[PDB]
């Protein structure tokens, strides 16, 4: 009857809602996890790039000064 | 009263189902973006490894020429 239909509908509404909320929480946990991973890999490769630039400048300074002192010593 | 309760349940169901439809679209969008981010990050990771490969190669090639001179 009418009371029965309303009760049944409320049971469904609550169950479906709580189910959806459980899934939404899992998906937000997943999303923050992925953001964490993305951050870690991005910053790691940022570091690798800074470190490469450091060792690049050290080797460019070491090699591009040997050629200049040869420019002087090939004139002698 | 029965009519009011029924009408409220209609609203609850419609609004809920609408919100769920939107949430699904937004989760599809989120996974899509994650896919893109991953693809670009890994592509530039590979470009960086390959740059380091070719750098060691050229450094070794110019070093051995400088040393034999």
């Amino acid at each position: 009857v009418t009371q029965n239909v309303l009760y049944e509908n409320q049971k469904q509404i609550a169950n479906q809602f709580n189910k959806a909320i459980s899934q939404i929480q899992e998906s937000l946990t997943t999303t923050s996890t992925a953001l964490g991973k993305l951050q870690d890999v991005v910053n790691q490769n940022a570091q690798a790039l800074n470190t490469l630039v450091k060792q690049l400048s050290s080797n460019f300074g070491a090699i591009s000064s040997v050629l200049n002192d040869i420019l002087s010593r090939l004139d002698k | 009263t029965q009519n009011v309760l029924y009408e409220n349940q209609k609203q609850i169901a419609n609004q809920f189902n609408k919100a769920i439809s939107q949430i699904q679209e937004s989760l599809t969008t989120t996974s899509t973006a994650l896919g893109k981010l991953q693809d670009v990050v890994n592509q530039n990771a590979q470009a960086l490894n390959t740059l380091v490969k070719q750098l060691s190669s050229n450094f070794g090639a110019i070093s051995s020429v400088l040393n034999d001179i």
């Binding site: 469904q12 189910k19 998906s27 991973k37 | 949430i23 989760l27 989120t30 991953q38 990771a45």
Partner: peptide
């Protein structure tokens, strides 16, 4: 120098699952 790779395929799978289980949560009144 260490570069690293990203693999969030598991995460994306878990999202696809979430979306598919939200399809089961609609209300047939």
């Amino acid at each position: 120098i260490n570069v690293t790779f990203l693999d969030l395929e598991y995460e994306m799978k878990k999202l696809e699952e979430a979306i598919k289980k939200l399809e089961e949560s609609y209300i047939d009144l």
